[PDB]
């Protein structure tokens, strides 16, 4: 917002949301899908 | 010329968005796709009777009783650490303002004692929207400032005047501008 | 540091924190000068 | 004779076709479509870059005034001189001489609220848009008029007519804007404390017409900050801001577009309804007043009333006499007979201020503060011998005044305000040729015939600064009496 | 599709092209005549513009140029002083003159029927003035009093001292009035030597505007200026980076400052861009403000200044650009409180340094709008037009029509401004002058290292 000094927490917000999307994608690939393809 | 070319990309996209503008109010497109609307509409008779109905009734019972114990209204739950509501409170008239002050005092004292009020003190509706006309005005006023001033990432002088320089307008609200003085008696921003 | 009769300012604009030491040591230019 | 106004009828149109006539306007620049850059890079400025396509064969515009009227009452006047920048102005017949004991200060409040929030625009958006178009705009209060005006390229006129008319059509007067704008009511006078000349002007006015009409102050006093509530402002506006009390004037715009965009402004809405107001005649009191302060001169002024003011027939006599005496040259009566014969005067001047139905005319001087009693004697002699004139000076003055008349109207803003002010004052514009024909007719006798009438009411006397040696009221009036005034 | 995309678009109005012509002609002796006729005016302006000033004094007689400006009104071979003054006044006309570092100007206003007489008078006082020694020895009183008064107008002394400290090695340094001892030592032979070295036909142009006909004016000039004599390498002035500070604590709380950079000549291609940069930085006054509060203004420099310490740190500031025949100056002037001076100055330096890194097209277009309003808004009266004719005739050898100026201004975008600034202003030398309570004042090296940012 205009007239405010908080400028570094928004960046961390976007980075964190990014990182969680990342982690969940990789976890689905690692723990579920790759084994599943051995059971498919 | 890299910059002017990417300019061209941005400009064409903006012109597309501009060309599709309506000239009058048009109802918003639904919030959910047709698949989920179909599924909800199918499962309504069970879901609303068994689960959603009682959930939404229990919720209001809980809220009402907690507000009545203390004698608060619902719009007494909003803070003034919220810019929009701070503006709304600035725009209030004397009587509403005084009554809000009084109710907050009483609620603090009652939560300290942890004593219920008599049931004859609890005969009122807590969910009246008494702040609405002022919140809408606050929203208008604070939206226009974003539109007319906040549309770019402005550049400043760093660590000068007690402000970091990246956008703040109140001194020493951030750690790297703490401790403004080493001698003397200090001072306050409100007395400049 | 400086005597109180030297560190009395003519202006009235608030001294910014980063200039503290600058105005604790203010001195008058008796007679003026050119540099 | 009043001008024959052309009618402009109201018509209602499809907005999506009217939107094809709106100028283009941008506030964001999301990228840019043109990539060619500076196409004249490296070309010196003494080497032309025009192609033969951009040459033209010149056709002048026609520059006699055009007069029109909307159906609701609004009068419109326009001229074009083919300049690139236009001048736009709205004139309202709401000065301070129309206030009373319950109203004092309301006009200043309205002026201090110009370009604030209205029905369809906010204050912030309004002023920011005016800034970004590149324009300069403002509002001015007088004793008989209130004026709004703006100025920028002529192609932006359709975007400026709303913002000027808004202020009189539908302001909101939200409390938190009134409250925030209050300090500007006091600074207006706080700055007058270092403008002695203007200060003396105000003293003259309040002493000449004590406590009535033109006498009222142009500012909010402390007593004026009570009735600073929206209902008084709104009730005052309902009595004055009706269309038939207004004029809209434009210079360097095409008249049919001006008429069209003005008509399109009032077509949807109800304007303030008319009122058959009446105005009282000023009562001239005269009198005497002093105000001491460390200034190193004795500032003095003496004045007499002009009966009838701008509506009196002798408007030309006073304006010629002022140039015989010496306006605000070096062969003038005061310059020769005062400034070149006394060592202790810094400046002597004749002043002339006129209003719709009364005025004043007098002399002003700055002197060594030890010799004020001599200053009064000099002024008394001068007043003593205004009655009589010789034809050399009279011809000098008439020629000088003609020159000044013609050369002052070579400037668009002055022309705009002149035309406006005249239309408000008497519903007619006097073209400079007519002013010259009137000047030429002034006789040697008429000067005496006017001054003999000027001296029939008591004087107005003001002193300012180091007044430590100024004679007493009776002494001043006896000095004037001895000199035959 | 949408009506919001159907708006009228006219960057340059048709009136910019439909303007009356400027007519030019060169006489055999080298004198140039220029004219433009304006149907909507009753009077006219006519005068002479001369390509000489104080830059063409010699260091021994510095101040002669300005003395001659007074002498030319003292009497001629044909008419006495009393006769000359009465023949000025009996026309009911105006006559003005002035001189500068590079240019000197005389002009009058009159109705058409009196243009001949005016020309005559002008020629007379330019060609045939009697510089009597017993009148030179009296004008010294008036010139000394004039200098006495000039020292009280602070802005002008600040700019003079900026020129003094910037152009140490060149006659641009010279002040127009000249030193005191030179005013006392001035002598007829010095004045006549200045005349006979600078008043040649190649250096003069005659211009008019209003209700004027080019043919009659050319004939009149041919008739009267037949007696003007005909004419018979130089290097770029060096710009020094230095300060010249007058500390004084007995003149109240306010400090005055001016800062300057090296500019470009009249004829340079980038001149227009410089005219634009001056507008991008703009100006501010705390006393009188229009209708936009400074704290919300679209100009970012004003906005940053007005929000400093919540009270704002300046009384007044204004930028400027000046172009000369072979060089220029570019900078700003300011007034502020003793304790605000530091911020008062460094904010505006940050302003000017932004032009090379971060400016955007919102700002460029705002500045274009304001610049156009200003310049196109002045050129209304006959005097402004005649002055513009003569000024451009001397500066360019021509007059540039409005359409050309607008077309060249239109195509400048942000990247072009950000190129020119990077060419001339980034990491440059600066010159400084100041007066008053300068205890706050920054170092020269501070102002010089300000011209670049270490960020980026
Ligand atoms: C095993 C599996 C699991 C793994 C773990 C997974 C964990 C996931 C969850 C993560 C949780 C959150 C982590 C932190 C996120 C921070 C985000 C952020 O930037 O917030 C902005 C936010 C403010 O943003 P804003 O509101 O936009 O305000 C704008 C202002 O302009 C902003 O200015 P301001 O003045 O208002 O703010 C203060 C300013 C300035 O603050 C200061 O100046 C304070 C300086 C204090 C120094 C004291 C010594 C500290 C030594 C490091 C200790 C690390 C311990 C780690 C724990 C594990 C140990 C094994 O600091 C900042 O802005 C933050 C800078 C970044 C902080 C990073 C902290 C974590 C890493 C640090 C260590 C890096 C590794 C190398 C060194 C390791 C040595 C052991 O700031 C905070 O909330 C920070 C709060 C304080 C916490 C940090 C304190 C330590 C500071 C260290 C600074 C770097 C130097 C390190 C030493 C190097 C030399 C040895
Ligand atoms: C102790 C400090 C030392 C003193 C000096 C200060 C040092 C700081 C210098 C670095 C800053 C350079 C960048 C200049 C930006 C200028 C922009 C501008 O015009 O200003 C207005 C603008 C705010 O105006 P506004 O747009 O109206 O405000 C609305 C909000 O910003 C909300 O806006 P929004 O929601 O619309 O979203 C906007 C957002 C949209 O974009 C995003 O949100 C993108 C998110 C994508 C996720 C990826 C992460 C993005 C962050 C990148 C971090 C990489 C840098 C580190 C590289 C390490 C290399 C070893 O825009 C950006 O993120 C663009 C700016 C991002 C730049 C951040 C990195 C700059 C550092 C470059 C130098 C790196 C060397 C470091 C060396 C190692 C030591 C640290 O300024 C900023 O946004 C500030 C950005 C820079 C961060 C603040 C600087 C830190 C100050 C605290 C010191 C903490 C130190 C802790 C250590 C303690 C030790 C004991
Ligand atoms: C034992 C530990 C000891 C630690 C000691 C550390 C000392 C460092 C001091 C930092 C510098 C001073 C900061 C004051 C800034 C004042 C605030 C301000 O307004 O500034 C505006 C200014 C921006 O300029 P502007 O506003 O555009 O206008 C400027 C004016 O026009 C014209 O400018 P001006 O005339 O106004 O002057 C401005 C001046 C203001 O200062 C002054 O006026 C006073 C002088 C400053 C202090 C000078 C002494 C410091 C000694 C430096 C060497 C320390 C080495 C320590 C190594 C420990 C070994 C055990 O600032 C500077 O010029 C400072 C330049 C030096 C800082 C940059 C160093 C970063 C290089 C990183 C290279 C990558 C290395 C990676 C490998 C790991 C290495 C460990 O801000 C700056 O640029 C200041 C520096 C910002 C920090 C950048 C990021 C730093 C992080 C580096 C990477 C960390 C590596 C760690 C990884 C380890 C791997 C194992
Ligand atoms: Zn002089």
- B56: tokens are 């939404």
Question: Which of B2, B147, B157 is the best substitution to test chain E (most E C-beta atoms within 10 A)?
Answer: B157
Contacts of A38 (CB under 8 A, 6+ apart): none
Q: Which residue of B has its CA nearest to C17?
A: B180
D153 touching chain E per CB within 8 A: yes
> Cα(D318)–Cα(D312) distance, rounded to whole angstroms?
11
Beta strands E316-323 and E328-337, pairing class:
antiparallel
Contact present, E55 and E172 (Cβ < 8 Å):
yes
Measure E175 CA to ligand 4 centroid, in angstroms: 13
> Cα(E382)–Cα(E108) distance, rounded to whole angstroms?
11
Strand partners, E24: E34
Confirm whether E347 is a catalytic residue: no
> Cα(B162)–Cα(B181) distance, rounded to whole angstroms?
11
Q: Which residue, by CA, sits nearest to atom 54 of ligand 2?
A: A11
Q: How far is CA E223 from CA D194, D389, E42, E220, E274, in A?
A: 54, 42, 25, 5, 42
Do chains B and C meet with 3 or more Cβ pairs nearer than 8 Å?
yes
> Cα(E325)–Cα(E276) distance, rounded to whole angstroms?
19
Counting atoms of ligand 2 from 1, which one is nearest the CA of A2?
27
Chain B residues in contact with E3 by the CB 8 A cut-off are: 23
Chain E residues in contact with C20 by the CB 8 A cut-off are: none
What element of type H or E holds C33?
strand C33-34
Q: How far is CA D20 from CA B23, B95, D16, D283, in A?
A: 13, 50, 7, 56
> Cα(E67)–Cα(E191) distance, rounded to whole angstroms?
7
A3 in ligand 2 pocket by Cβ < 6 Å? no
Q: Which residue, by CA, sits nearest to atom 40 of ligand 1?
A: B176
Half-sphere exposure of D148 (CA within 13 A, CB side): 24
Q: DSSP code of B22?
A: -
What element of type H or E holds C2?
none
- E324: tokens are 């000369």
Question: Which of E4, E346, E352, E353 is the best substitution to test chain B (most B C-beta atoms within 10 A)?
Answer: E4
In the set E102, E139, E262, E387, the catalytic residue is: E139
> Cα(A12)–Cα(A17) distance, rounded to whole angstroms?
9
> Cα(E332)–Cα(B157) distance, rounded to whole angstroms?
19
If we measure between CA atoms, which residue out of D470, D272, D307 comes closest to residue D373?
Answer: D470
Q: Which residue, by CA, sits nearest to atom 16 of ligand 3?
A: B159
Are E253 and C16 inside 8 Å of each other by CB?
Answer: no
Alpha carbon of A1: minimum distance to chain B alpha carbons (Å): 7
What element of type H or E holds B172?
none
Using DSSP's 3-state secondary structure scheme, residue B86 falls into helix
Measure E46 CA to ligand 3 centroid, in angstroms: 64
Chain B residues in contact with D122 by the CB 8 A cut-off are: 141, 144
Q: DSSP code of B163?
A: B
> Cα(E450)–Cα(D41) distance, rounded to whole angstroms?
29
Using DSSP's 3-state secondary structure scheme, residue B18 falls into helix
Give the CA radius of gyration of chain C.
11
Contact present, D39 and E411 (Cβ < 8 Å):
yes
- Residue E4, Cβ density class (10 Å: 0-12 exposed, 13-18 middle, ≥19 buried): middle
- Residue E151, Cβ density class (10 Å: 0-12 exposed, 13-18 middle, ≥19 buried): exposed
A5 touching chain B per CB within 8 A: yes
Contacts of E392 (CB under 8 A, 6+ apart): E398, E399, E400
If we measure between CA atoms, which residue out of D123, D299, D107, D88 comes closest to residue D188?
Answer: D107
> Cα(E184)–Cα(E182) distance, rounded to whole angstroms?
5
Contact present, D54 and B23 (Cβ < 8 Å):
no
Question: Which of D31, D34, D122 is the best substitution to test chain B (most B C-beta atoms within 10 A)?
Answer: D31
> Cα(E259)–Cα(E432) distance, rounded to whole angstroms?
5
> Cα(E359)–Cα(E367) distance, rounded to whole angstroms?
12
Q: In what order do the strands lie in the sheet with E104-111?
A: E22-26, E32-36, E204-210, E43-50, E104-111, E94-99
> Cα(D67)–Cα(E152) distance, rounded to whole angstroms?
51
> Cα(E31)–Cα(E36) distance, rounded to whole angstroms?
17
Backbone angles phi, psi at E209, to 5 degrees: -160, 150
Counting atoms of ligand 3 from 1, which one is nearest the CA of E353?
31
If we measure between CA atoms, which residue out of D399, D403, D376, D432 comes closest to residue D324?
Answer: D399
Beta strands D287-292 and D460-465, pairing class:
parallel
Half-sphere exposure of E385 (CA within 13 A, CB side): 28
Q: Which of residues 1-35 of C touch B (CB under 8 A)?
A: 14, 16-18, 20, 24
b/e string for E318-337 if b means 16 or more Cβ within 10 A? bbebbbbbbbbbbbbbbbbb
Do chains C and D meet with 3 or more Cβ pairs nearer than 8 Å?
no
If we measure between CA atoms, which residue out of D330, D190, E39, D31 comes closest to residue B2?
Answer: D31
Using DSSP's 3-state secondary structure scheme, residue B156 falls into coil
Q: DSSP code of B49?
A: I
- Residue B46, Cβ density class (10 Å: 0-12 exposed, 13-18 middle, ≥19 buried): exposed
If one residue of A3, A7, A15, A22 were mutated to test the ligand 2 pocket, choosing by the most ligand atoms within 8 A of its CB, it would be: A7
Residue with tokens 């650009």: E321
Beta strands D75-79 and D246-251, pairing class:
parallel
Q: How far is CA E37 from CA E108, E215, E392, in A?
A: 16, 12, 17
Nearest CB among C11, C15, C35 relative to E245 is that of: C35
Do chains A and D meet with 3 or more Cβ pairs nearer than 8 Å?
no
Chain B residues in contact with D177 by the CB 8 A cut-off are: none
Ligand closest in space to the Cα of A12: 1
Alpha-helical runs (H) found in chain C: 20-24
Q: Which chains touch A (3 or more CB pairs under 8 A)?
A: B
A38 in ligand 2 pocket by Cβ < 6 Å? no
Alpha carbon of E250: minimum distance to chain D alpha carbons (Å): 20
Are E247 and C23 inside 8 Å of each other by CB?
Answer: no
Q: Which chains touch D (3 or more CB pairs under 8 A)?
A: B, E
Q: Pocket around ligand 1: residues whose beta carbon is below 6 Å from it? A: A 6-9, 12; B 164, 166, 174-176
Binding residues of E for Zn(2+) are: 70, 146
Using DSSP's 3-state secondary structure scheme, residue C34 falls into strand
**What is the 3-state secondary structure of chain E?**
CCHHHCCECCCCCHHHCCCCCEEEEECCCCCEEEEEECCCCCEEEEEEEECCCHHHCCCCCCCHHHHHHHHCCCCECCCCHHHHHHHHHCCCCEEEEEECCCCEEEEEEEEHHHHHHHHHHHHHHHHCECCCHHHHHHHHHHHHHHHHHHCCCHHHHHHHHHHHHHCCCCCCCCCCCCCHHHHHHCCHHHHHHHHHHHCCHHHEEEEEEECCCHHHHHHHHHHHHHHCCCCCCCCCCCCCCCEEEEECCCCCCEEEEEEEEECCCCCCCCHHHHHHHHHHHCEEECCCCCCCCHHHCCCHHHHHHHCHHHCCCCCEEEEEEEECCCCEEEEEEEEEECCCHHHHHHHHHHHHHHCCCCCCHHHHHHHHHHHHHHHHHHCCCHHHHHHHHHHHHHHHCCCCCHHHHHHHHHCCCHHHHHHHHHHHCCCCCCEEEEEECHHHCCCHHHHHHCCCCCCC
> Cα(E11)–Cα(D444) distance, rounded to whole angstroms?
58
Binding residues of E are: 70, 146
> Cα(E331)–Cα(E318) distance, rounded to whole angstroms?
9
What element of type H or E holds A33?
none
Alpha carbon of B119: minimum distance to chain E alpha carbons (Å): 52
b/e string for D263-279 if b means 16 or more Cβ within 10 A? bbbbeeeebbeeeeeee
Can you give the resolution of this entry in Å? Answer: 2.8
Counting atoms of ligand 3 from 1, which one is nearest the CA of B159?
19
If we measure between CA atoms, which residue out of E30, D33, A28 comes closest to residue B14?
Answer: D33
Contacts of D288 (CB under 8 A, 6+ apart): D207, D460, D461, D462, D473, D476
Measure B186 CA to ligand 3 centroid, in angstroms: 29
Q: Which residue of B has its CA nearest to A8?
A: B166
Using DSSP's 3-state secondary structure scheme, residue B148 falls into helix
What element of type H or E holds B19?
helix B2-19
Ligand closest in space to the Cα of E455: 3
Nearest CB among E310, E343, E360 relative to B152 is that of: E360
> Cα(D94)–Cα(D365) distance, rounded to whole angstroms?
33
> Cα(E37)–Cα(E43) distance, rounded to whole angstroms?
11
In the set E14, E15, E60, E69, the catalytic residue is: E69
Contact present, D187 and D135 (Cβ < 8 Å):
no
- Residue C3, Cβ density class (10 Å: 0-12 exposed, 13-18 middle, ≥19 buried): exposed
Contacts of D226 (CB under 8 A, 6+ apart): none
Beta strands D136-141 and D146-153, pairing class:
antiparallel
Nearest CB among B159, B161, B181 relative to C20 is that of: B181
Q: Which residue of E has its CA nearest to B188?
A: E309
Contacts of D35 (CB under 8 A, 6+ apart): B1, B4, B5, B7, B8
Q: At how many degrees (to 10) do helices E271-281 and E361-378 cross? A: 100
Backbone angles phi, psi at E436, to 5 degrees: 115, -150
Contact present, D280 and D450 (Cβ < 8 Å):
no
Interface of E with B (CB under 8 A): 1-5, 296, 300, 304, 307-311, 343, 346-347, 350, 354, 357-358, 360, 362, 415, 455
Using DSSP's 3-state secondary structure scheme, residue B153 falls into coil
Alpha carbon of D58: minimum distance to chain E alpha carbons (Å): 6
Using DSSP's 3-state secondary structure scheme, residue B70 falls into helix
Residue with tokens 């307008």: B169
Alpha carbon of B31: minimum distance to chain D alpha carbons (Å): 29
Confirm whether E139 is a catalytic residue: yes
> Cα(D5)–Cα(C17) distance, rounded to whole angstroms?
67
């Amino acid at each position: 917002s205009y007239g405010n000094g908080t400028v570094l927490m928004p960046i961390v917000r976007r980075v964190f949301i990014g990182a969680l999307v990342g982690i969940y994608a990789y976890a689905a690939t690692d723990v579920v899908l790759i084994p599943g393809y051995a059971q498919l | 010329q890299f910059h002017r070319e990417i300019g061209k990309l941005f400009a064409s996209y903006s012109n597309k968005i501009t060309a599709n503008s309506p000239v009058q109010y048009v109802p918003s497109p639904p919030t959910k796709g047709k698949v989920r609307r179909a599924l909800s509409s199918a499962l309504m008779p069970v879901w609303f009777k068994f689960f959603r109905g009682p959930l939404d009734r229990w919720n209001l019972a809980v809220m009402a009783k907690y507000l009545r114990d203390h004698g608060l209204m619902y719009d007494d739950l909003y803070s003034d650490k919220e810019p929009v509501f701070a503006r709304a409170l600035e725009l209030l008239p004397p009587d509403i303002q005084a009554a809000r002050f009084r109710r907050l005092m009483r609620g603090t004292y009652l939560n300290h004692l942890r004593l219920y009020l008599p049931v004859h003190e609890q005969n009122y509706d807590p969910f009246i929207p008494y702040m609405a006309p002022y919140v809408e005005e606050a929203k208008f006023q604070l939206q226009e400032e974003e539109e007319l001033l906040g549309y770019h990432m402005w550049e400043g002088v760093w660590y000068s005047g007690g402000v970091t320089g990246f956008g703040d307008k109140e001194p020493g609200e951030h750690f790297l501008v703490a401790l403004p003085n080493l001698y003397g008696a200090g001072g306050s921003p409100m007395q400049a | 540091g400086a005597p109180k009769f030297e560190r009395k300012m003519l202006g009235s604009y608030p001294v910014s924190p980063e200039f503290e030491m600058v105005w604790r040591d203010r001195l008058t230019a008796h007679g003026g000068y050119i540099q | 004779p009043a001008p024959e106004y052309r009618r402009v009828p109201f018509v209602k149109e499809d907005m999506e076709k009217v939107m094809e006539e709106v100028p283009e306007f941008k506030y964001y620049y999301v990228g840019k479509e043109n990539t060619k850059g500076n196409v004249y890079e490296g070309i010196p400025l003494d080497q032309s870059i025009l192609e033969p396509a951009d040459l033209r064969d010149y056709v002048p515009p026609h520059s006699n005034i055009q007069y029109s009227k909307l159906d609701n009452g609004l009068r419109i006047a326009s001229m074009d001189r083919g300049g690139l920048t236009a001048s736009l102005g709205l004139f309202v017949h709401a000065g301070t001489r129309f206030e009373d004991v319950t109203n004092f200060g309301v006009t200043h409040m309205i002026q201090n609220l110009a370009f604030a929030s209205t029905a369809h625009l906010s204050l912030l958006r309004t002023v920011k848009t005016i800034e970004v178009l590149g324009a300069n705009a403002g509002c001015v209060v007088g004793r008989e008029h209130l004026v709004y005006s703006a100025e920028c390229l002529r192609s932006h006129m359709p975007l400026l007519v709303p913002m000027l008319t808004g202020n009189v059509l539908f302001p909101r007067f939200l409390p938190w804007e009134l409250k925030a704008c209050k300090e500007k009511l006091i600074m207006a006078r706080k700055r007058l404390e270092h403008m002695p000349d203007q200060m003396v002007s105000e003293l003259l006015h309040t002493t000449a017409w004590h406590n009535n009409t033109l006498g009222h102050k142009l500012h909010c006093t402390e007593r004026s900050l009570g009735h600073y509530n929206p209902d008084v402002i709104r009730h005052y506006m309902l009595q004055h801001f009706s269309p038939e009390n207004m004029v809209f004037v434009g210079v360097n715009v095409n008249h049919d577009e001006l008429c069209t965009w003005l008509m399109r402004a009032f077509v949807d809405y109800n304007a303030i309804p008319p009122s058959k107001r009446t105005v009282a005649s000023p009562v001239y009191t005269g009198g005497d007043v002093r105000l001491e302060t460390p200034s190193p001169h004795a500032h003095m002024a003496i004045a007499f009333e002009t009966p009838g003011g701008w509506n009196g027939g002798d408007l030309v006599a006073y304006s010629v006499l002022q140039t015989i005496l010496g306006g605000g040259g070096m062969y003038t009566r005061l310059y020769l007979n005062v400034l070149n014969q006394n060592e202790w005067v810094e400046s002597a001047m004749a002043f002339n201020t006129q209003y719709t139905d009364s005025g004043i005319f007098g002399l002003y001087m700055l002197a060594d503060p030890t010799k004020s009693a001599n200053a009064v004697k000099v002024m008394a002699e001068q007043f003593g011998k205004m009655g009589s004139v010789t034809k050399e000076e009279l011809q000098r003055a008439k020629n000088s005044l003609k020159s000044s008349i013609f050369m002052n109207l070579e400037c668009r803003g002055i022309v705009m305000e002149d035309v406006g002010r005249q239309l408000l004052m008497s519903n007619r514009v006097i073209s400079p040729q007519e002013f010259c024909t009137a000047i030429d007719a002034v006789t040697e006798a008429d000067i005496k015939r006017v001054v003999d009438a000027m001296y029939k009411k008591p004087p107005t006397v003001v002193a300012y600064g180091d007044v430590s040696t100024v004679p007493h009221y009776e002494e001043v009036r006896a000095a004037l009496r001895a000199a035959g005034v | 599709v949408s009506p919001l995309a159907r708006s009228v678009d006219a960057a340059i109005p048709e009136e910019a092209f439909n303007q009356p012509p400027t007519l030019t002609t060169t006489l055999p002796n080298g004198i140039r005549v220029a004219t433009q006729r304006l149907p909507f005016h009753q009077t006219a302006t006519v005068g002479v513009w001369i390509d000489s000033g104080s830059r063409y004094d010699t260091k021994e007689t510095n101040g002669a140029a300005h003395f001659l400006e007074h002498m030319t009104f003292k009497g001629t071979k044909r008419r006495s002083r009393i006769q000359l003054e009465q023949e000025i006044e009996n026309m009911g006309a105006h006559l003005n003159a002035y001189t500068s570092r590079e240019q000197t100007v005389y002009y009058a206003k009159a109705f058409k029927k009196d243009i001949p007489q005016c020309v005559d008078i002008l020629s007379d006082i330019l060609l045939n003035s009697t510089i009597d020694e017993e009148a030179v020895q009296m004008e010294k009183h008036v010139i000394l009093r004039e200098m006495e008064e000039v020292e009280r107008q602070t802005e002008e002394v600040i700019f003079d001292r900026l020129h003094t400290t910037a152009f140490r090695d060149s006659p641009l340094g010279y002040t127009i009035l000249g030193p005191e001892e030179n005013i006392r030592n001035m002598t007829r032979e010095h004045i006549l030597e200045y005349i006979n070295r600078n008043y040649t036909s190649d250096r003069m142009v005659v211009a008019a505007a209003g209700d004027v006909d080019h043919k009659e004016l050319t004939a009149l000039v041919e008739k009267h200026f037949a007696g003007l004599p005909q004419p018979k390498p130089t290097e770029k002035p060096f710009f020094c980076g230095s300060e010249l500070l007058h500390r004084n604590d007995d003149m109240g709380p306010t400090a005055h400052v001016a800062v300057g950079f090296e500019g470009v000549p009249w004829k340079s291609p980038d001149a227009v861009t410089f005219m634009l940069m001056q507008a991008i930085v703009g100006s501010y006054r705390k006393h009188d403000e229009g209708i936009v509060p400074g704290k919300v203004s679209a100009n970012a420099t004003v906005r940053n200044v007005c929000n400093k310490m919540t009270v704002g740190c300046a009384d007044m500031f204004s930028a400027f650009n000046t172009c000369y025949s072979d060089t220029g100056l570019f900078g700003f002037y300011a007034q502020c409180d003793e304790v605000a001076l530091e911020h008062c100055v460094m904010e505006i330096m940050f302003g000017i340094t932004s032009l090379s890194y971060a400016v955007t097209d919102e700002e460029v277009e705002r500045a274009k709008a304001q610049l156009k309003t200003q310049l196109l808004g002045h050129l209304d009266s006959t005097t402004a037009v005649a002055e513009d004719i003569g000024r451009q005739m001397l500066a360019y050898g021509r007059r540039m029509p409005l359409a050309e100026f607008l077309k060249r201004l239109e195509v400048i975008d942000a990247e072009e401004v950000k190129r020119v600034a990077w060419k001339y202003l980034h990491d440059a030398e600066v010159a400084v002058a100041g007066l008053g309570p300068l205890f706050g004042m920054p170092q020269l090296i501070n102002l010089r290292r300000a011209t670049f940012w270490l960020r980026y």
